[PDB]
Amino acid sequence: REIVHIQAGQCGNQIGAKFWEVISDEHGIDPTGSYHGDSDLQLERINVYYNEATGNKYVPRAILVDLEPGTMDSVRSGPFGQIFRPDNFVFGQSGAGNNWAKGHYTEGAELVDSVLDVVRKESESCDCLQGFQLTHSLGGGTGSGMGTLLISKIREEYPDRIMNTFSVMPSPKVSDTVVEPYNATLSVHQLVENTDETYCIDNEALYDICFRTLKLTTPTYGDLNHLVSATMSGVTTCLRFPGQLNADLRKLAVNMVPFPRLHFFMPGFAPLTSQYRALTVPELTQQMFDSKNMMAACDPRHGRYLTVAAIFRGRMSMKEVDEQMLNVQNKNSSYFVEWIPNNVKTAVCDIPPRGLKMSATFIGNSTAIQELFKRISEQFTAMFRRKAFLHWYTGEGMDEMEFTEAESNMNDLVSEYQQYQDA
Amino acid sequence: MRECISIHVGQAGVQIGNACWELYCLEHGIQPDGQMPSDKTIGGGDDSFNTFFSETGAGKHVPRAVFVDLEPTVIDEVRTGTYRQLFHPEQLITGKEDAANNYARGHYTIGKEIIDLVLDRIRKLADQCTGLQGFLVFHSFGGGTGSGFTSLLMERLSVDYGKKSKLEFSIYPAPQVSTAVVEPYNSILTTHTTLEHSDCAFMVDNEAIYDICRRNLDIERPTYTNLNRLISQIVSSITASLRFDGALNVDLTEFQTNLVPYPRIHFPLATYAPVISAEKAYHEQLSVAEITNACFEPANQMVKCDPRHGKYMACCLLYRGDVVPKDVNAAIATIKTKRSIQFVDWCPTGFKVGINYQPPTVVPGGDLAKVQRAVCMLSNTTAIAEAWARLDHKFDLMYAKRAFVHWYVGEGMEEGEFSEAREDMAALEKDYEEVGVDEE
Amino acid sequence: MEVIELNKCTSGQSFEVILKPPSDPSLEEIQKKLEAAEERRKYQEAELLKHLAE
Amino acid sequence: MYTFVVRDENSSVYAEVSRLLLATGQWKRLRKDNPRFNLMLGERNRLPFGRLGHEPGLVQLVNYYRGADKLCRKASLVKLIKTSPELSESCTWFPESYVIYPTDEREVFLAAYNRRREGREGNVWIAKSSGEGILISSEASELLDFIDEQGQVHVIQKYLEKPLLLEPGHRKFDIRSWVLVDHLYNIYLYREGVLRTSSEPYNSANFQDKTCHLTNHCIQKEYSKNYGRYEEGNEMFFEEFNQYLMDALNTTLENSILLQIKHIIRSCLMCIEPAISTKHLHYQSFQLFGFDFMVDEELKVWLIEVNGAPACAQKLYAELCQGIVDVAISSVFPLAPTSIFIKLH
Ligand SMILES: Nc1nc2c(ncn2[C@@H]2O[C@H](COP(=O)(O)OP(=O)(O)OP(=O)(O)O)[C@@H](O)[C@H]2O)c(=O)[nH]1
Ligand SMILES: Nc1ncnc2c1ncn2[C@@H]1O[C@H](COP(=O)(O)OP(=O)(O)CP(=O)(O)O)[C@@H](O)[C@H]1O
Ligand SMILES: Nc1nc2c(ncn2[C@@H]2O[C@H](COP(=O)(O)OP(=O)(O)O)[C@@H](O)[C@H]2O)c(=O)[nH]1
Ligand SMILES: [Ca+2]
Ligand SMILES: [Mg+2]
Ligand SMILES: [Mg+2]
Ligand SMILES: [Mg+2]
């Protein structure tokens, strides 16, 4: 059951590149596509993310998309650059200028058919295509505008397949342009309708974790992406290694999404790395549920957990893992909804990540995520009430109504999260 | 000699089928290559074991079993496992993608595309039967295949094999090893669609066998292998009368006749003893009275419930090992004076006892110690309705918010089927209450 | 108590102890059920493709 | 720390224990329908025992014994004493009783009503049920005309027309004892009982007047004219009652009465123990009981009724409720010396 990976834009390709860098190491595959591993657990579910070529070389089932060639070239020359299929690079020259409209309506519309051709040829060779995962930002133009265009086109062609995204939410604390709330609000409207699962990765949380916890005074995007690729590896551990819980994308969606529109997740990782003493099972459980280890910049105590998925990596006792998981929810049961019995499911994997002997990745569908969309909504309205910077978008053919609709739909999403926070 | 066809559906059904058929071969002396040197009638016979094994010209003894899963991983283990030579490829059926813990996806979407394949494969086994007596269906309540596809198969089996007995071995969902949050939904839906098509169903709560593995076997974190090897022992003691010479429960109809006076109330409670760890270096063998007494201890039941606060309708005692009737009678007389055994006033206070002199067989290298005598009690008590109440309550909590219902509607199922299924469980719950219950 | 219907053999033994006396859907309908869900499943997908075409 | 829920708020006894569970700083209260609890202060009717003991990693305790109603209902208690060989029907501490429905014991009741008539013996009976039924008469005809007129099932019992009368006053009483049974089925008798007395002098000729015959605290508050003369709230405690027995009868409360009380309590609870014990169950039970006794002229103690959801005297709420935390709750969920109870069994 194969997954097709797509990375779009500057952020999506840089984060996507680190992700393939991390999991290729976990599966014992060198930058030349050859396998030099020590355990058959590495190859047991390798087909989920890698195709096979003659000579027992493994090619990632990844498609690199961008409207300017800059980041594409950087990925091709960086580490693990030549592991990617050469013709799976689809890029233009104009760029999108941090403009959702340019990515979604004009510049990206000229390029989307080329991408769907690569998506089609990758899907046609799949034994039983499980679904798609997309990495992108919502604050730019290509990953935001063209990314959500791709999702809409892919859903039209593969309507019975799971659509998954890793979506980087913008923040004024790590900002490129002031129009990021516009692009983010336009993209959320698309994600609410056309994805089954979306991991909300807030650049504000990533910065704060790098600043306060990891003691990085001047964090870079590379520092933030080290955190993203680490959680991307953790949330996909159940998909890449033998397991019983949340082993495929649809089963995870059935366990994590009680209502179709509420499919935005808070990821969390422990321990946070930028490591000689191994962490204990109580220490992993306490950290992975702490706010400081959350990637969405939302205090979970401000809302309630609809469902929670947790994975533990390394050689440990499942007894102490069950004891600690049961301890954290029996002594914080007010933060878990009572109308979804047993909404916390745990999985374990014997393969630990690189450099760590024990690790824990957290996946939460909390109503506290509304804090994220409310921040975006306030930044959106602050400019939109004065129609500020709108000409960049109306110049690409957009109408003010489309902004009013995306704004209204996201405020509904916030109100719908507040509905289930009370019971 | 009337043949029996076993159908294993879903991951839980298939993996338990492995544990059982492995144990069947150890009990009848069948080697992994299908050969049985004990059988001197090569190529056929009307012996008792022939109800579960057919014979080829080469002397291979082949299970009368079909394995069905909407997903190839678990069954591919069988195709390459220790008993790969036991089954022939036609008996193993695998789909492309599974039901994703969705009853509707297993019943409607994927069920429609594979139900005719499965039935035709079942017809191939049925045609080799001079007088087929029915089916034993192993599945889970919680899985989308085990719940959704089974109820569809049980509907068609009643159509193609009219008034042929169908017995279930159903795995009740327990959160300690469960994989899905919607298992209450799947359980209620499959119990609704299957109720009229099942003559007798044995429920095993994974919670019950999980704790038995922790307490009696001293296993820290029991795995499915631990659980299934214990389940197979219970299944073997229930099907032993169909595979060995005897006079109690020698056909599938006798299970309904002996245990099910009311057709909807066809869920007997199973209790088993003794469960002794094989790593326990020193052990003192238990008596007939001690293992019979344990049959009335909740800690040894397949479903945790209190029979003292229900009413009995029937009781079967199935012994294996060194047990003579005098020991059983002296034990039952002692137990009646010390324990609360209340029968419904219209049924007779009695026990149907069966004894098989062969002691229970244990897989070499397993967790169970070989014991000189064991007993499995099948009792149709109204106390098992506690398991329906728990399930119905969890169903009620989620459904009041319509949590997750869009997954089922998205597969073509109508929201009204939830109500129709829950109303049926309410009626079933009221039926048990009619039968078992009479500032200061 | 009373022992009745005692049956013996070399394999085992069975009997009964008494202590106290007392005091369907057809194939056509199933195929219609599955096809009704198949049509509802196709109607929903058609509305999706209609929504995406707009 | 530990967690608990409350499902019967109009319970004065357990409203106080949940208040004490707060002050320890080691117990948090949850809402009614939160399943992740260690302790349930459950409701009085239809308590969902079947949903208890199925939460992984949660030792769960409940404040009621499933099946204890067979002792705490008039109809079932009569049946329990009549049929249990441990009580053997002919136990000397329970008045002659028959269950008459409005199966049926109407024939055998009239049979004993004739025997008492033949010997010209005291033939006065009482009619009670599960509010108040309040019928005492000397002829069974007036009893049944009232039973069938009422809806629910009533049970007839021989009236102890020769009761022990307190002086000064010439007044009868009933003794209430509180018994706590923990998860191990130890039987603890609270050292402090209470006497619920009558304020008017006892009268043998006026059975239609039900004030000097019925010792209920609600009836003495409603119909007694000189209520509260001798003791505060028609409640006399053990130290005063024991002093009276010494001054008036040259005996003690322990010797004359309490030995029989401890025997009656032990007998009733040891009988139903195999039916209600939670020794090897997936959940465990404790329960507080209120036994109602009666004493006659010859210092013989009679069991009248067992109450499964009793209240306490106002003076004794603090001591008794703290005892429930120590003995019944902290024994299963410890925190971070002389006892107020009397271990029987
Ligand atoms: N005792 C026991 N229970 C099992 C086993 N395998 C799965 N289960 C239980 O079955 C339930 C899940 O159903 P499954 O049988 O795994 O799912 P399925 O029938 O394959 O259906 P889908 O995977 O959704 O297509 C959970 O409650 C598991 O605890 C097993 O081998 N032994
Ligand atoms: N057989 C008898 N002989 C003498 N007095 C009796 C009696 N039966 C009952 N009584 C008197 O009747 C009073 C009330 O009886 P009972 O205890 O049944 O009422 P009740 O159950 O409504 C009050 P509670 O709330 O304590 O259960 C007793 O306190 C007792 O004085
Ligand atoms: N975490 C992270 N965020 C990024 C990175 N690059 C850009 N961003 C964020 O993404 C938004 C800009 O999106 P970008 O990918 O540059 O636009 P695009 O190339 O047109 O799709 C801003 O909110 C940036 O903070 C990166 O490498 N890591
Ligand atoms: Ca033969
Ligand atoms: Mg950029
Ligand atoms: Mg499966
Ligand atoms: Mg009362």
Tab-separated table of N, CA, C and O in Angstrom, chain B residues 323-351:
chain	number	residue	atom	x	y	z
B	323	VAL	N	-10.815	-37.761	34.772
B	323	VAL	CA	-12.049	-37.348	35.433
B	323	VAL	C	-13.058	-38.482	35.307
B	323	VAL	O	-13.381	-38.904	34.191
B	324	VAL	N	-13.560	-38.973	36.439
B	324	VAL	CA	-14.634	-39.968	36.427
B	324	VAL	C	-15.914	-39.301	36.923
B	324	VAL	O	-15.844	-38.291	37.637
B	325	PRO	N	-17.094	-39.813	36.558
B	325	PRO	CA	-18.340	-39.142	36.967
B	325	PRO	C	-18.510	-38.996	38.469
B	325	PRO	O	-19.153	-38.036	38.910
B	326	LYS	N	-17.957	-39.914	39.269
B	326	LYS	CA	-18.137	-39.832	40.715
B	326	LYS	C	-17.523	-38.557	41.278
B	326	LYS	O	-18.103	-37.919	42.165
B	327	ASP	N	-16.351	-38.168	40.768
B	327	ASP	CA	-15.713	-36.937	41.224
B	327	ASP	C	-16.535	-35.712	40.845
B	327	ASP	O	-16.631	-34.758	41.626
B	328	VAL	N	-17.125	-35.716	39.646
B	328	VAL	CA	-17.913	-34.571	39.195
B	328	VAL	C	-19.136	-34.383	40.082
B	328	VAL	O	-19.418	-33.277	40.555
B	329	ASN	N	-19.883	-35.467	40.314
B	329	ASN	CA	-21.096	-35.386	41.121
B	329	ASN	C	-20.789	-34.903	42.533
B	329	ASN	O	-21.483	-34.030	43.068
B	330	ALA	N	-19.748	-35.462	43.152
B	330	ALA	CA	-19.370	-35.038	44.495
B	330	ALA	C	-18.945	-33.576	44.525
B	330	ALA	O	-19.114	-32.900	45.545
B	331	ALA	N	-18.398	-33.072	43.420
B	331	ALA	CA	-18.024	-31.665	43.346
B	331	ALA	C	-19.246	-30.773	43.179
B	331	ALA	O	-19.352	-29.733	43.837
B	332	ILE	N	-20.176	-31.169	42.307
B	332	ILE	CA	-21.368	-30.362	42.063
B	332	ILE	C	-22.216	-30.264	43.326
B	332	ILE	O	-22.793	-29.212	43.626
B	333	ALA	N	-22.295	-31.355	44.091
B	333	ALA	CA	-23.032	-31.317	45.348
B	333	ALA	C	-22.388	-30.352	46.334
B	333	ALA	O	-23.086	-29.622	47.047
B	334	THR	N	-21.054	-30.332	46.385
B	334	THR	CA	-20.356	-29.414	47.281
B	334	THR	C	-20.536	-27.966	46.840
B	334	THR	O	-20.693	-27.069	47.678
B	335	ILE	N	-20.529	-27.723	45.530
B	335	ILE	CA	-20.612	-26.358	45.022
B	335	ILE	C	-22.014	-25.793	45.215
B	335	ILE	O	-22.183	-24.603	45.512
B	336	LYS	N	-23.042	-26.634	45.064
B	336	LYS	CA	-24.414	-26.159	45.204
B	336	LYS	C	-24.691	-25.629	46.604
B	336	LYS	O	-25.501	-24.711	46.773
B	337	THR	N	-24.023	-26.185	47.617
B	337	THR	CA	-24.231	-25.744	48.990
B	337	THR	C	-23.476	-24.463	49.325
B	337	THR	O	-23.853	-23.774	50.278
B	338	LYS	N	-22.431	-24.124	48.570
B	338	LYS	CA	-21.576	-22.994	48.906
B	338	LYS	C	-21.720	-21.802	47.971
B	338	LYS	O	-21.201	-20.727	48.293
B	339	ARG	N	-22.402	-21.946	46.838
B	339	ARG	CA	-22.440	-20.891	45.838
B	339	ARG	C	-23.873	-20.597	45.413
B	339	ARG	O	-24.790	-21.395	45.625
B	340	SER	N	-24.046	-19.422	44.807
B	340	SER	CA	-25.352	-18.945	44.357
B	340	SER	C	-25.556	-19.391	42.914
B	340	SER	O	-25.052	-18.764	41.979
B	341	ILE	N	-26.298	-20.479	42.733
B	341	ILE	CA	-26.625	-21.009	41.414
B	341	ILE	C	-28.143	-20.975	41.299
B	341	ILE	O	-28.835	-21.889	41.767
B	342	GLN	N	-28.666	-19.923	40.680
B	342	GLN	CA	-30.101	-19.713	40.545
B	342	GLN	C	-30.507	-19.953	39.098
B	342	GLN	O	-30.089	-19.214	38.201
B	343	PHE	N	-31.314	-20.984	38.876
B	343	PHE	CA	-31.890	-21.255	37.570
B	343	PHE	C	-33.233	-20.547	37.429
B	343	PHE	O	-33.911	-20.246	38.415
B	344	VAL	N	-33.611	-20.274	36.180
B	344	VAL	CA	-34.955	-19.786	35.908
B	344	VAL	C	-35.951	-20.877	36.270
B	344	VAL	O	-35.713	-22.067	36.021
B	345	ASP	N	-37.071	-20.477	36.876
B	345	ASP	CA	-37.974	-21.452	37.479
B	345	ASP	C	-38.564	-22.421	36.462
B	345	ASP	O	-39.021	-23.501	36.849
B	346	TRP	N	-38.557	-22.075	35.175
B	346	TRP	CA	-39.087	-22.969	34.156
B	346	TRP	C	-38.038	-23.917	33.586
B	346	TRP	O	-38.401	-24.866	32.885
B	347	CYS	N	-36.740	-23.688	33.867
B	347	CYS	CA	-35.742	-24.664	33.459
B	347	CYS	C	-35.362	-25.559	34.633
B	347	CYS	O	-35.457	-25.147	35.794
B	348	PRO	N	-34.942	-26.794	34.366
B	348	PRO	CA	-34.487	-27.667	35.454
B	348	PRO	C	-33.071	-27.328	35.891
B	348	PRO	O	-32.193	-27.047	35.070
B	349	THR	N	-32.855	-27.350	37.203
B	349	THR	CA	-31.523	-27.140	37.770
B	349	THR	C	-30.693	-28.389	37.507
B	349	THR	O	-30.812	-29.391	38.216
B	350	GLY	N	-29.854	-28.343	36.474
B	350	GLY	CA	-29.115	-29.521	36.073
B	350	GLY	C	-27.815	-29.177	35.382
B	350	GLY	O	-27.525	-28.018	35.079
B	351	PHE	N	-27.027	-30.222	35.138
B	351	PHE	CA	-25.743	-30.112	34.463
B	351	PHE	C	-25.609	-31.258	33.476
B	351	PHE	O	-25.780	-32.423	33.850
